[PDB]
Design a protein around this ligand. Structure first.
Ligand SMILES: CC(=O)NCc1ccc(S(N)(=O)=O)cc1
Ligand SMILES: CC(=O)NCc1ccc(S(N)(=O)=O)cc1
Lengths: 304, 304
């Protein structure tokens, strides 16, 4: 028993982290087979970042301008290309620690693990969610660009995020491993405001199920509601609308606990309207939305 | 910027996890050099756990009764001994992935990473603290016994915890890697109540410093206090007494932020007396005490 914000074991990804240096800029790269993936802004001076023309900056760069170091050993770059906002550096050596892997573009509300890295060296691992405004709330200092987000299915690492920038509000923006930004963000040092950071309703419901499973049940009430009635309250409280797809996804937690999804919706509605009144749920004074229904099943069942 | 509950990268420890089976009991072992460490209750039936005589149960066990599997490969057990509440199984093969390592017994308030494992396979990694009542608030299902807690200093894993039991209140108890329980707990299925779970004051102060550093400053007030005055409020709110040793440890965060430790104490005092009034700090509606001053410096500076 007990419920923790839990990251995937990071060893498979630690095995892939390298240092990329172009001129005086160093950041992190991901070494899979004989390709190193990194943010294309590795080619920018801090001046360049104000208004970079990436195609024009890249003309001035050759293979030997990209310095790739894996541990204390230099990789030979035999090719480079730009795909959206990432550089792919072809090296002459396949990463021998390359795990089974996929590139996946996640949806808002989806959770993943970040291996925060500096100079191609892992510092830490944390769990986070793609926010409905396509930001993430990470912990990233200068040099952390190219740090990656991932999920693991048994022995297959699905990479979903590469870190690129911090917005002036101190939230984070990045790409999938095809170099396409989540949300409207660009790899430029300009005014970029995030939209409304709404609460991931289905994730809150999953976490309330996790709480019931772990014995925290004080918030269970006498009421039910409808998807339409619930959604009126959701909208008022900047919670994402709940769809029948979300209800279906919560089916197994509903079944395990014998609490119908709409009854749990009515409990959540009373928590929004009444607040927590100084009480906690799974040791939180606010409603946690960075567990997916899949995360709650995984942690409550013990998947490895 | 941003501040996350961050675990150490787990790969060095993933490399050490094995499955130990004695009779019908399977749990996790830690394979360092040619020794596998595991909870001695691996030799107990669920009946045995009510009143185990470990010395007498162990007489009935030989080397070949301990089945050690690392991946899908069986290790040969050439010796076994009981040290306090752990078994040490000598195997004929040194773990080739053995990291540089130490065994350390931590103090209450100290944080560490847990690699939660089942059948010797890592499922997840989370950060937690040795509570002042020598419990930890983990996430452990049946089969998670032998899962270990650790800190990393560059390339040296300091193992500080092995998971042994869940108390009837659903909090967790375990040993250092010499098999000595944290607190008064025993590896027996009996009434065992935890003492007062007090708040780790120095850790709250560290986290308030982390908040100031990351731009969350609304709680900074006009007041100071003394260690004696502060400690009167601490005691009233079940916070641990603050010592001059704690003040000294907070010195570098004090220096970085230009907020004297006693002024931050006076801010914390007003937060205890006034509550958060529906406001958050680093996205928490309560005061987080599972970051050490060292954790805050590490995360705010980017140590790898
Ligand atoms: C050329 C060769 O034989 N092997 C390639 C290799 C493998 C691992 C690393 S690593 N994980 O130390 O950075 C670096 C280079
Ligand atoms: C006998 C030998 O040559 N090597 C020992 C060995 C190394 C690694 C593993 S492991 N990490 O697959 O479980 C299992 C056994």
């Amino acid at each position: 028993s007990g419920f923790r914000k839990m990251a995937f074991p990071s060893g498979k990804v630690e095995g892939c982290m390298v240092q990329v240096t172009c001129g005086t800029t160093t950041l992190n790269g991901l070494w899979l087979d004989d390709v190193v993936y990194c943010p294309r802004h590795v080619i920018c001076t801090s001046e360049d970042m104000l208004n970079p023309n990436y195609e024009d900056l890249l003309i001035r760069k050759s293979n030997h301008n990209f310095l790739v170091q894996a541990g204390n050993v230099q990789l030979r770059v035999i090719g480079h290309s730009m795909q959206n906002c990432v550089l792919k550096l072809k090296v002459d050596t396949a990463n021998p620690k390359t795990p089974k892997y996929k590139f996946v573009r996640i949806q808002p509300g989806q959770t993943f693990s970040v291996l925060a890295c500096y100079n191609g060296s892992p510092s830490g691992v944390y769990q986070c969610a793609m926010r409905p405004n396509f930001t993430i709330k990470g912990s990233f200092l200068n040099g952390s660009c190219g740090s990656v987000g991932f999920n693991i299915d048994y022995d297959c690492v699905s990479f979903c995020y590469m870190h690129h920038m911090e917005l002036p509000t101190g939230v984070h923006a990045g790409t999938d491993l095809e170099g396409n930004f989540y949300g409207p963000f660009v790899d430029r040092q300009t005014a970029q405001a995030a939209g409304t950071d709404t609460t991931i309703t289905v994730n809150v419901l999953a976490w309330l199920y996790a709480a019931v499973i772990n014995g925290d049940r004080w918030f269970l009430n006498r009421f039910t509601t409808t998807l339409n009635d619930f959604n009126l309250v959701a909208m008022k409280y900047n919670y994402e609308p709940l769809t029948q797809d979300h209800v279906d996804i919560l089916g197994p937690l509903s079944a395990q606990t014998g609490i119908a999804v709409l009854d749990m919706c009515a409990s959540l509605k009373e928590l929004l309207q009444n607040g927590m009144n100084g009480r906690t749920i799974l040791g939180s004074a606010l409603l946690e939305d960075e567990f997916t229904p899949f995360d709650v099943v995984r942690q409550c069942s013990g998947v490895t």
